[PDB]
Design a protein around this ligand. Structure first.
Ligand SMILES: NC(=O)c1ccc[n+]([C@@H]2O[C@H](COP(=O)([O-])OP(=O)(O)OC[C@H]3O[C@@H](n4cnc5c(N)ncnc54)[C@H](OP(=O)(O)O)[C@@H]3O)[C@@H](O)[C@H]2O)c1
Ligand SMILES: NC(=O)c1ccc[n+]([C@@H]2O[C@H](COP(=O)([O-])OP(=O)(O)OC[C@H]3O[C@@H](n4cnc5c(N)ncnc54)[C@H](OP(=O)(O)O)[C@@H]3O)[C@@H](O)[C@H]2O)c1
Ligand SMILES: NC(=O)c1ccc[n+]([C@@H]2O[C@H](COP(=O)([O-])OP(=O)(O)OC[C@H]3O[C@@H](n4cnc5c(N)ncnc54)[C@H](OP(=O)(O)O)[C@@H]3O)[C@@H](O)[C@H]2O)c1
Lengths: 474, 474, 473, 473
């Protein structure tokens, strides 16, 4: 199979050791990626630090052009990359091409968003008369070397969301894709190589996150860690980061609160699309329904039928439900199913597993006593929790240690907004499924779902500090 | 003994154990402060979390009103507080009173700055045509419970700079002052008590940071940690915070770069004032002069003469140089002085120590081979390092692990601005000593000097998060 | 009792004066000066002379002066209110409220203004070759600002211009309305006691029909901040030449009522918005556009609430007091007669006692009636029934006025979509229209005005920018 | 030969036409329609009809159209520049530069405008009782914008208005200068090929002397964005009424030279800023205010550098080219004559051949000479010797113009101090004046303009705000 290579200091490098990658759906070998040594990781960081000063010396418009070029290249090769991305993560071919497309759209937007960066002028006379002739010219500077780490489910899209914002501001990148998804990650790297950015400005790292994961995060050459993945790992990175700045996008368990005055048809469709997209292997997705009892039977009946219409199959055919990322992930999901079942939950759709392809399951009658009501499944299993008041839904919703997003289905806006203030999440969508949707929009999670505010504009702000030059006027 | 109490959930409290505080300049007992146990800490936090919701439900102008009363009380009692502060940390009485005035000003400014909290409306149609009718209404929200920790040299000033910005935003506070300075800390607490903020909104914690320090920081009730202290403790706080947000203000070794075309008389005064203020026990302060050989002889001669003009005595006499904070510090400072003398640097003043009162001393011909070239003394000792190029001055300056602020004395502004870009620090002052000065201005430190951007406005932004509510217009 | 203008630190009288009478009783209140052109010239010359030293002060210093003035107004709110109440026949308690509102706006403008910020723009954003070139952009004052207030809020709509103007470093020439000049000068007193530098703040009294055009045409004035009728507003638009202006003009705010509305909540908001100060409010519900199906219910509710309104003298705090003058009363009565005479259904008796007009509600008002379009400025409310939301938007936009609008309904997304279509500045959902919350932007479309007000915007409007560009080496 | 106007997606000629000739050669370039008032009415009627649907489009959709227009311009920069150069006798290479610059501004405005954001304000910021009330403020287009460019930059100063306008959701009615209308129609071609909806972008041609007032006074126009003489500008101010406007008028930029100035750097900048396009530029050094102790040395450097300036035809990219028309050169000659009679010294040959005047350097110019204040728009540079910085500022501010200023010194703190005092929009330290980098603000003080330009400010200027207020429950 093809031995992929990391892009280091303008050169493609193999490592003495490698990691073989297999297709989650077919099981066929896709290729191998390098299993870097600490020494090699040192070389990557040393290269990026050396290239930083000259990268920062360039003009904003110059750096923007480089990023636009990468986007253009990605668009040109969107089908070649999608073909392999689809295979590497058992993701539908079309959505795979979609991820590549969104990645280009984000890179472009971040490029133009970051070149308009401005500074401020503050008046000393605002705080004290004696200082009225003193002013502060405050401009933005990069934080230095940014370590970007993406997730298996969006190894490219959630790579660009970090890389472009970091680069437009004059930062340099060390990109570490998920092992399962590193080929797609290195394919993204090829685009940066061809755009011709100076050597060391963009570099990749590959190896098992469990073998060099800590080493790359603890390394003192790194000035900022931008991460997406499980909460468990996020916590660890939080500590290893020390006092250095970070950005974390972690686990989710988005609740969809359904009131009595909700358009039940619109709620059912939105929940279906949000809950079962990518077989529930999505971070920001409806993972629990908190519906007022008087409307529960009707809502559940609607959701049941819609689940039956979902297509089940191979990513090749763009099936709604494809095989899960791996065996363990599927075993884990079966565990949640067993627990809900043993404790009384009602499965309204067939419980079936063929390999790692689990059929879409609708669990009604789920209670706060079942694991499924709290733990993030990352499988096609949607639990329905019947409540008796808005107050109860909020309690249950906030009880979760997760707070990425929430949906409120109601026709009483003012109340919706009031409820929104109470929910401990980053974003609340009214009468719509949750979604990172519209990358210029802020994206964040409360509690253990993250740290920092994402969304293009915010990402750029997050990976820059300020340099204040003060002087008195004569 | 005069036993001071902590302010907890609207009440004053003592603990089974206490800590006696003495005057660093005389040994006289000032009183004692409680040495809280973990249970008492747990209660402070439980009381704060309970009061946070009702505090956040208030209007901005209401919270602003409460803060303005505190400020008025502080001004009214500036002579009272100043008197005790002066004795607790052996700081000049007049500067002590000035600290209180500075605290009130900051509280007033944070009240008005924060009540004008604004949000933003983003257009979905900015990213994709299909979401043109989708908008995002983003409003600021508090993070929750903020743990504020001040240093011994500005126990009140560096308390207000955290408390007020935090409170106006809807966060609740737990204020931990430094032990040597805890009486002044509880005096400040009095103002919040008399102002009548709801019980639990503001609370204090006293005890040895080496006995409960880690406990209060590690407690999972704390949502944010705002700290000013040594780099050592800061690094420690960065780790215990996990993935929780923090603000750190640490060690400094601000350099004063002096170019050949500088106004030597103006440069000497700024240097004398900046380096010897509060006997060098300041964080933002000229602690090393990097001066071009060409003008070094003349510059040094001016500084030498101004040093001998500095008054030395007790805090009640408003002396320039007063006894250091404690024996360990005087010992340490004496150690740095001796290492420079023994290594051959040129002492331009007599070496003299009486008790913990170290006479101001100037060293010329200091080399990078000397400890005094890098270590933060926190004593009246100023090293002069001669250089032969701006290039070298910049290298020596960036070589330090500290990067709080810096001073550039020159008449070539364009170049001064150019040099500023290269200096790894937060703020660069042209023709003026370094200073946090004008609290509306950003205040941050690079490398190991800190994390986060202070300055009233920035403090508020840092201690708030965002809540996005998205819906479609019909 | 003769009142004097405040000019260049001195209180000055003119030979010619103008007596002011209580609109409710007719009792003489006092007299205000009737300035000559030369006198006006001195006010302006004093201001221009003082502007440099005024601008040279720190922002915080200027804010302290304003905070002073405000504190003084709060202290004398009853004293000033008692006279304002009588000068424009406004409820005593609400007159005091105007004073407080004025103090609040002054304080708020003080703190909003000292936080004035600048920008640092990067040349490298536009072209590589200019990457070392930066622009430090700071805000500066325009110069001399001429503020003119209306009779209905002679003080409130004075401070809303003066404070924003001053904090930014401009100097003020304040022209209160003739009927309301005593309250204006009373305000002037607060500024005098505050001790602002001589010439920084000045007042001008005199009939707008005798000197109005002169004060505006004077080439010393750099900015005109006006509140009044559209007719005058439009004139100022022309006399201003190319100079910057801010105009707050006429309004005929509509209250669109949909079928899913809370009729009880809608009625109360409409009563409050329509009859406040006897309808002598610019931003106020002046026409209801309601879906037929719920028209009958809504109208019955509004009818009863109208009858519960108090009618009387300003000292008794009546809801409905005598209109500002006889000419206005005649106009309002003409609008009432035209509606009745054309077949509109009057749900309240028609009665005028002197210049006191009783609140009246007209139902079945057609676009054929004058009341459907002209700003009455009296206690008369027309109800126009429509059969669709589309028709309500058409009827609303058809007006030449577009200050604010109200939409009563439970369908928010639809309300937002309607707001976009409405040609107005602000749309309130399930609430009467209001300038309310002075930090909020306040503006009108079409013939309702020019420029965006509200503390923040007022300040931005009365300052320009100074860009200093240089290259870093 | 016969060019057509682009109206509502169609190219149309008018009953009458206007012939355009090459300023430098006199040859006929072609003709442009001479619209009748009725044809103007159709342009406005068409644009107002297509505005709603143009506004209904997403920001990114509108930005895409602008990008395409920009791309077409880059593709035809030579083709267009060749004709532009001849229409206004501008160097061929700099003519192509205008087109490029125009494309750059269009792309920048597209991306700047699509990122447009709104704001949410808290009622609880002003009063505790309105803490549940919030205002969702979003930006809306003003509607129909009339864009009018000058002869010297018919394409550049057209696109600087059109792009910021369109991205915001407004519709455009573009009126170029007669001498430059062909270029303008060439620009229109790019918009037609980009395929923007019909009526969104339209052009108007006709002598600004017959329809000039008609197009401005028309009530369909919501905003007028103009660049031209102070005279026509003052007039548009009045004809605008109370409608919003943007004016970029005349300038008499001063270059203040201090004793510590880098005289060689100073001189080079002055030569470049003063004689660019034969002085037919608005933002340009038009008067040197130099300290006496260094004048002789600076004047000598300037005198020599002037002699190195090329003089000839536009096709040869000559530094100095014929002036726009006969009257202009007559006017310049009038200035040179008054300067001579009054005593000034001409250090370079005074010569006129046709409408091509050789670069003239006048030294010993006093404030009594017309040349010291009047905008020449000819290759004539007056040097005014002062004996104190205080005087330089006085003389500089004495002018009725205040577009930009240059300060050549090395004492920055002081330069900044001088800058605050200079009554201009922008101050360049040690660099000739310039609209320099389009994201930077561009504005003029006093009679040099109205409104703040610069891409970002342009967009904000041609947009209003819509506030929807509701209470959270
Ligand atoms: N909120 C959001 O925006 C967001 C976005 C994406 C994902 N998520 C969450 O991410 C999870 C699914 O992603 P995943 O399975 O890929 O998560 P994961 O197992 O946490 O890994 C995420 C990334 O972390 C790397 N990693 C592992 N151990 C590390 C260590 N010690 N130090 C540094 N990096 C280390 C991984 O490398 P290897 O692949 O080599 O192990 C991978 O690139 C879900 O819980 C989902 O909700 C949330
Ligand atoms: N950049 C800035 O703005 C800034 C401002 C102020 C000070 N500083 C730096 O601070 C130093 C002087 O202050 P200092 O000597 O008082 O600092 P310090 O010893 O680090 O202590 C500062 C505060 O931290 C508390 N603390 C100690 N151990 C702790 C622990 N394990 N967990 C949580 N809190 C703990 C202390 O309590 P106890 O008093 O009970 O030990 C005290 O309140 C200098 O290095 C100076 O440069 C910098
Ligand atoms: N500050 C700046 O950015 C800037 C930029 C460019 C020019 N300028 C100034 O403009 C002047 C040179 O330009 P110019 O000679 O073309 O200016 P102009 O004579 O004032 O005319 C400018 C534009 O106005 C049109 N126009 C004429 N009469 C009009 C009327 N009654 N109503 C509406 N529009 C009318 C002209 O049409 P016709 O061609 O049909 O006459 C032309 O398109 C100088 O004073 C220069 O400083 C300033």
């Amino acid at each position: 199979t093809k031995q992929y290579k990391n892009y280091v200091n303008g050169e493609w490098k193999l490592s003495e050791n490698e990691i073989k990658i297999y297709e989650p759906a077919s099981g066929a070998e896709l290729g191998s990626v390098p299993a870097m040594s600490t020494e090699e990781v040192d070389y990557v960081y040393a290269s990026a630090k050396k290239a930083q000063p000259a990268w920062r010396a360039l003009s904003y418009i110059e750096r923007a052009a480089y990023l636009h070029k990468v986007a253009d290249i990605l668009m040109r090769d969107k089908e070649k990359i999608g073909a392999i991305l689809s295979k590497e993560v058992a993701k539908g071919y079309k959505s795979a091409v979609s991820e590549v497309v969104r990645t280009a759209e984000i890179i472009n937007y971040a490029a133009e968003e970051g070149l308009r960066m401005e500074g401020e002028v503050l008046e000393g006379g605002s705080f004290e008369a004696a200082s009225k002739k003193k002013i502060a010219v405050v401009r933005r500077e990069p934080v230095g070397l940014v370590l970007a780490i993406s997730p298996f489910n969006y190894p490219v899209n959630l790579a660009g969301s970090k890389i472009a914002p970091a680069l437009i501001a004059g930062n340099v990148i060390a990109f570490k894709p998920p092992t399962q998804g590193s080929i797609s990650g290195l394919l993204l790297a090829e685009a940066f190589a061809e755009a011709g950015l100076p050597a060391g400005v963009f570099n990749t790292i590959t190896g098992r996150g469990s073998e060099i994961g800590d080493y790359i995060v603890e390394h003192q050459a790194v000035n900022f860690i931008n991460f997406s993945g499980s909460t468990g790992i996020g916590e660890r990175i939080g500590k290893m980061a020390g006092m250095r700045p970070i950005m974390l996008e972690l686990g989710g368990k988005d609740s969809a609160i359904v009131l009595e005055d909700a358009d039940l048809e619109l709620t059912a469709k939105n929940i279906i699309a949000g809950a079962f997209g990518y077989s529930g292997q999505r971070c920001t997705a409806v993972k629990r329904v908190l519906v007022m009892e008087s409307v529960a039977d009707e809502l559940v009946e609607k959701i049941r039928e819609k689940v039956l219409a979902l297509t089940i199959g191979n990513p090749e055919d763009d099936a709604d439900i494809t095989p899960l990322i791996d065996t363990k992930s599927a075993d884990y999901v079966e565990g949640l199913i067993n627990d809900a079942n043993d404790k009384g939950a009602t499965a309204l759709t067939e419980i079936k597993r063929e390999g790692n392809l689990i059929c879409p399951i609708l669990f009604d009658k789920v209670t706060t006593d079942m694991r499924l009501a709290w733990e993030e499944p990352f499988g096609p299993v949607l639990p329905i929790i019947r409540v008796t008041s808005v107050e109860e839904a909020i309690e249950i919703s906030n009880k979760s240690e997760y707070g990425l997003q929430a949906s409120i289905f109601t026709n009483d806006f003012p109340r919706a907004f009031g409820i929104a203030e109470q929910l401990e999440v980053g974003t609340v969508h009214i009468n719509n499924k949750t979604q990172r949707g519209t990358d210029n929009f802020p994206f964040l999670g409360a509690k253990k779902s993250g740290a920092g505010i994402q969304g293009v504009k915010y990402s750029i702000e997050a990976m820059t500090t300020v340099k204040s030059v003060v002087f008195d006027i004569k």
